[PDB]
Design a protein around this ligand. Structure first.
Ligand SMILES: Nc1ncnc2c1ncn2[C@@H]1O[C@H](COP(=O)(O)OP(=O)(O)OP(=O)(O)O)[C@@H](O)[C@H]1O
Ligand SMILES: Nc1ncnc2c1ncn2[C@@H]1O[C@H](COP(=O)(O)OP(=O)(O)OP(=O)(O)O)[C@@H](O)[C@H]1O
Ligand SMILES: Nc1ncnc2c1ncn2[C@@H]1O[C@H](COP(=O)(O)OP(=O)(O)OP(=O)(O)O)[C@@H](O)[C@H]1O
Ligand SMILES: [Mg+2]
Ligand SMILES: [Mg+2]
Ligand SMILES: [Mg+2]
Lengths: 523, 523, 523
């Protein structure tokens, strides 16, 4: 269609208006005094959330240029959520601050490309200073504190995540699922987790979470891909009367002959899913056999000759719950046989003792770690569905924050870490004056998370930011109790990965956003 | 017509919106970093002004309820301008702060009338503390500094006002009038100032200043009020052909047979004005004779028999310039005869030496002070008319501020005095908790001038207000040089009258503005 | 009515848009390659003009804020025209350049008040440098060149003005009036010129020139002010049937019972005018007698007893043409009697020889200079009315430029003088950085006249401005011949007064409007 073309300050102010609308929508959910946001859903009841990425994804504007700015900044929250699962609101606030101050510097007649270069240099130095300032979560041992801070000052969620990490190890898999009671339960059941995703994007279930769940699914395993379609048609017909959703674990699955025909077959009464198998060759067969033994199923092969036409409902495996994500596909509870599971674990341990090759040894330790750790399931208990969704989102944030803390370490929370690493960069300089001004813009935008947190509390952000800048170390402001102190000692811990990722993504998108002179869109 | 009637929070927010529009229009002109405001004029070129009362007077809003609020707060600026001639911007800012915080308190459920009572008590205590904290301008001897600060950091204006007060005394009459060159010139000439005003409001000249000026006026004096018009009809005809506008100085003047017939006679080509004569009986005759001798004219009387029908144009007096105001009517330059003026001065001094009655003695000293002091005329020099008006307004502000300083004293400027008197009232309490909340609202609203001044500088008002509150005495922030120090030593002085008047009028109006529950306006 | 209030950048850009519209309308008439502007007139045929102030006065915009900016900049052209009668386009261009660069500096976050202070300081230093750089027109003797440059490279107009100044002296009065032929003609006749103006603004004739002309007027003189109407009513009636418009020369004339009655008397068939008489007492009587003898009239006085009731048409004086302006009222051609004129000249010269008082001697020399110089009338010859008006405006510009040249001196034309005096100020500095940036803004805006002149020629303003800046002395660019050289030697001379006045008025108004934050107007 015909395109509308805006230039210079008009385009910049329209894009800034869109950015500001999206951020102001998001920024009200920052800190412990931050508030919730009601998101209208055409599907059902409205969703109340404190999650920044949900608000950002829901935001869309009427004006095309403001919508351009809003989408381009929404990219920050989306990337932060994908990378770390937390700090989306902080990333959006940082992007908004960088954009505002960069547009101020652009109005002053400064070269926007040099401003972008200065912002990038300052952010790189800041990331280095964060890596230097980070303190490992193993040394601190404050997993409960990280989970509590991430769960909006919820002690129970933090203690639950700490217990779950104590049971299945600091690296064991944990899955958050809806509970049934009014209290949060921790279930440590048998399951199997592998980094694989669904082949087709249509397999997503009704909720927009991007991960499809199957209620009491059925397990199908195979290592060789068969040519014809009619051969497993009796299997699908048996699946068409087993009553349980079918999950297909094989080497790889296509769509033109399987996904399209199955889409045209039924209207979605029962969701049929297919996933890849991790590894290749002998390893793929090994994990396929392990999964089959876990779920009580069997794996077909050329050597065995166990053709699917002879496969029955009893032969194939079954699980109580399976959740499939593009990043990683997990099995929540595969019944199988407990004695069979223990025997397989003993056999794999004996293989570990016998094996000596470093690659074989390490993959065998990975297998036994997956088997022994199991699947830790946290039941989100709430009296209503809206509270179920809200608390489930909070527990997911706590889980991601704890994972980031164990993977990379922790820093003082409440924006104090960015305040500190901004003070150490006061002597950083660039090639020219515009680059130096961009560096200063990046340094000022690092106070934005703390200033926003204080603004949500009703206090004065300038005074509190100055007071925190006057301190040293982990000295900062406790937004929950309206007093200053040591952020680490007060248990307000933020993962280093979350802060670094938010800073980096906000920096990239915002620095690209201040070099824009013309914007083209429809009419 | 039919009335639109609003209730409760809707009426309160409409009123607050109007108040905020007016105050935001006014508040941009506060402090040395305050900016000018352009007022569109239907007559000619737009007026550029930093004066708060002009902006407030020009503000009028489309929405009827918002217009209610705007007029209600414009009352504050008008009252402050009338009382002190300075501090209209500060008064408007204080009223806006009181209104906003009182509406916040009302939304919290506080009783608005008790809040108003608490605000009144706090403001009375603050006025007492201002009187206690005031420092006389005679002891300080900083007239030049007061004028310079009042003239928006113009050293030349302050030095000019200091010289004028040195010449005609600290109580002499000083008049600001348009000059001709590009430089400000001070002229000390012979004239008379007496506290009387125009009888009819029709006499207002084309400018909205409220005071009519006459270019080379003619002087008419009389102590007896004659009945029939036809006796002065030859006099009026001679006046209506002499070429110089007529000023009538007599006991008292009507409008139904004088102003109405004049309006029906003249269309405004040459203005004819009539003023009252100060004093009564013998005193009125004495001042009439003094004015006639000053302008070279004569005074008619029944005893003398000097009938106006025989009066000629040469017999009547003449002045080079006369300015008439409702509060006080002054004669700028009456030629008369210098020898006659000196002889009259000597005669009145001899009368002083002969007289012994306290009332007669004091009125004779007032007469000789009026004659000896003369009229100090300040010629505003500007290359254009807009600069003429702007600099004339600034010089008028300096004049009023210096008068208030000599009359009442000075306090630390830049909102520091209100900050200091806010801390001294921290222990003040009212009858109930509502009154205490009102007192705290009044105390917080008294930081508004300093915070607004700092905001205009582009600094952070919270931090600077905190730093000033942490000091003591005359410690404060220099908005002109962006540094702290002793307000008095740095030369930024505010008259105690101006600050006290702004506080009191803002308090009265704003406190009455938060007790509203219904608004009744047209449709 | 309800007011529209705009803040910050919105008001700034609206006012800048109005300023730019008015200037772009005006700026096309700058330099020798500048073009004409057609102005619609409801009175009659459209007017083609190259005069800046005419275009500025005709400009009025639909949007209220843009209209405010346009009016405020129109003030620059009006003030320049009033002060110097030339350089109004240069004044408007300088104002526009200052406004644009000051708004650019304001967008950069710089204090507008300090920018205004820096602009004022730079302009003051520039005026001093212009006074230093000025070269007297007596030493140069290039009156023809000044008139030719001012008359849009018209050699005949310059030579005519040079001849007139030679005939009547460098200070003698010259009047431009419509001719009858197709050629410009110079007439040196007998007349009277005195610095007085019309008492009432209603007396302005049909054209908007602000000066009323009377076709074969009648002369009325008086030294004593008359009282009633009925004693001169026969005199007016004789005047009201003599056939020639009446000019009243007296001490001072009112409007209440004289202007209003005469306005109600006629609808505008024959204009009756009254003017003041310069001087007082004996001097006023002396000039009244001189004017009466020049026009063959008589003077009414109390001592003589010659009462107006007995005055006849033959007794009163008559003139061939009279032009009345607020600044100065002149008599173009008074017939009277040549022998009487010569006898009066001889008598006044004898009085000069007899008189010895310095004031009396100097006023007598002024009288004899007025009589001997006479009135030099330039007849503007054109084949049509539009060409009549255009060439008359050009000759008026040449006259004003030549008067300014004799009064103050000349500098190199074509914006070269401002370029030079801007280079000498490159080392000027202010109190702070914002003041320095304002100084630089003023220095850059001084290249604007030259850049606009080159832009009108189709050349590249940047290259030519750089080339002129690289030169020294009066080296510059000849816009008429598209070559560089010495502007003085090439005959392109500009009066120092014109350049200085344009710079000063542009500076004042433009600097006042870069400090505007809010903006109030109707809806
Ligand atoms: N009690 C507290 N006192 C001070 N700061 C706190 C406190 N609790 C949390 N914070 C800080 O507030 C932020 C957490 O807020 P929140 O989790 O709502 O936002 P986020 O991390 O940007 O991401 P998201 O909204 O997507 O979860 C972190 O910067 C954390 O350090
Ligand atoms: N250099 C300065 N530093 C700090 N404060 C200053 C300075 N100059 C003036 N002030 C303060 O700013 C105020 C004067 O500003 P401004 O003249 O604009 O407003 P006003 O006096 O309230 O009234 P109005 O606008 O009617 O003249 C006073 O409170 C004065 O003490
Ligand atoms: N031949 C020329 N070469 C270069 N510059 C010239 C030449 N003739 C005139 N100028 C310059 O052009 C300007 C005169 O232009 P113009 O008379 O059209 O403008 P103006 O007097 O400002 O306008 P307006 O008549 O509307 O008041 C002066 O700066 C003069 O020095
Ligand atoms: Mg978070
Ligand atoms: Mg003031
Ligand atoms: Mg010209």
């Amino acid at each position: 269609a015909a395109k509308d073309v805006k230039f210079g300050n008009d385009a910049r102010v329209k894009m800034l208006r869109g950015v500001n609308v999206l951020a102001d929508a998001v920024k009200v959910t920052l800190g412990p005094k931050g508030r919730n946001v009601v998101l209208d859903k055409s599907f059902g009841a409205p969703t109340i959330t404190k999650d920044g990425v949900s608000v950002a994804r829901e935001i869309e504007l009427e004006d095309k240029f403001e919508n351009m700015g809003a989408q381009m900044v929404k990219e920050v929250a989306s990337k932060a959520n994908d990378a770390a699962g937390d700090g989306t609101t902080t990333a959006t606030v940082l992007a908004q601050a960088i954009i505002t101050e960069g547009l101020k510097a652009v109005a002053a007649g400064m070269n926007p490309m040099d401003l972008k270069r200065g912002i990038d240099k300052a952010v790189t130095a800041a990331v280095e200073e964060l890596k230097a300032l980070s303190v490992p979560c193993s040394d601190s041992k404050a997993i409960a504190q990280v989970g509590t801070i991430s769960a909006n000052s919820d002690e129970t969620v933090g203690k639950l995540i700490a217990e779950a990490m104590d049971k299945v190890g600091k690296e064991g898999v944990i899955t958050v699922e809806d509970g049934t009671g009014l209290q949060d339960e921790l279930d440590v059941v048998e399951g199997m987790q592998f980094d694989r995703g669904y082949l087709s994007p249509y397999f997503i279930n009704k909720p927009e979470t991007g991960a499809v769940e199957l209620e009491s699914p059925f397990i199908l395993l195979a290592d060789k891909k068969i040519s014809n379609i009619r051969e497993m048609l009796p299997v699908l017909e048996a699946v068409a009367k087993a009553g349980k959703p079918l999950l297909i674990i094989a080497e790889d699955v296509e769509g033109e002959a399987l996904a399209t025909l199955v889409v045209n077959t039924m209207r979605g009464i029962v969701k049929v899913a297919a996933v890849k198998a991790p590894g290749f060759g002998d390893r793929r067969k090994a994990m396929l056999q392990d999964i089959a033994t876990l779920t009580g199923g069997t794996v077909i092969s050329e050597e065995i000759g166990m053709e699917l036409e002879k496969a029955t409902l009893e032969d194939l495996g079954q699980a109580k719950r399976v959740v499939i994500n593009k990043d990683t596909t997990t099995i929540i509870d595969g019944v199988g046989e407990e004695a069979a599971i223990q025997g397989r674990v003993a056999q794999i341990r004996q293989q570990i003792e016998e094996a000596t090759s470093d690659y074989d040894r390490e993959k065998l330790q990975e297998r036994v770690a997956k088997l022994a750790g199991g699947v830790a399931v946290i039941k989100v208990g709430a009296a209503t569905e809206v509270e179920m969704k809200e608390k489930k989102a909070r527990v997911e944030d706590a889980l991601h924050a704890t994972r980031a803390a164990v993977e990379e370490g922790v820093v003082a929370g409440g924006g104090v870490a960015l305040i500190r690493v901004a003070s150490k960069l006061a002597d950083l300089r660039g090639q020219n004056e515009d680059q130096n001004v961009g560096i200063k813009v990046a340094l000022r935008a690092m106070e934005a998370p703390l200033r926003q947190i204080v603004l949500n509390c009703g206090e004065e952000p300038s005074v509190v930011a100055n007071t925190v800048k006057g301190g040293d170390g982990n000295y900062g402001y406790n937004a929950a109790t309206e007093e200053y102190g040591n952020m680490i000692d007060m248990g307000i811990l933020d993962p280093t990965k979350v802060t670094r990722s938010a800073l980096q993504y906000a920096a990239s998108v915002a620095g690209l956003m201040i070099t824009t002179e013309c914007m083209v869109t429809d009419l």
